[PDB]
Amino acid sequence: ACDYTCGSNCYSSSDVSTAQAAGYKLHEDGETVGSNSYPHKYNNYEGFDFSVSSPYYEWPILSSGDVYSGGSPGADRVVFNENNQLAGVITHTGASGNNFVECT
Ligand SMILES: Nc1nc2c(ncn2[C@@H]2O[C@H](CO)[C@@H](OP(=O)(O)O)[C@H]2O)c(=O)[nH]1
Ligand SMILES: [Ca+2]
Known part of the structure; x- marks a missing residue:
């Protein structure tokens, strides 16, 4: 079973922890990757709880x-x-x- 289901994509907790660790590291070092500069601020315009x-x-x-x-x-x-x-x-x-929606 998927811990997180984004549309058709299936992710486990380990998938999330691995991605998160990489993003946080870049954040700490003040560096970014990609043309859209990730990681970057998420303003939460959607208003998720x-x-x-x-x-x-x-x-x-x-x-x-x-x-x-x-x-x-x-x-x-x-x-x-x-x-x-x-x-x-x-x-x-x-x-x-x-816009974004939460993965179930
Ligand atoms: N939908 C949405 N986009 C946000 C929010 N905060 C920042 N963004 C940025 O606005 C764009 C929406 O897809 C993305 O930029 P990006 O194109 O540079 O990645 C996204 O990262 C937010 O709260 N909601
Ligand atoms: Ca996986």
Whole structure:
């Protein structure tokens, strides 16, 4: 069973922890990857009820199982905070335009 289901993509907790660790490391070092500069601030315009405090940062999680290193980020993202706490896993899949919905 999937711990997080983003559309058709299936992710386990280990998939999320691995992606999160990479994104947080880049955040700490003040570095970014890709043309859209990840990781970067996630403003939460959607208004999700996150259990952890802001600021939030978004980082791509890939269905391939690889850690994001540039190029197309796909539709899925892990959102973490300043303390490297997982806020949640969100996706563009099933959401209009560039909006997000939570992965179930
Ligand atoms: N939908 C949405 N996009 C946000 C939010 N905060 C920042 N963004 C950025 O706005 C764009 C929406 O897809 C993305 O930028 P990016 O294109 O540079 O990755 C996304 O990272 C937010 O709260 N909601
Ligand atoms: Ca996996």
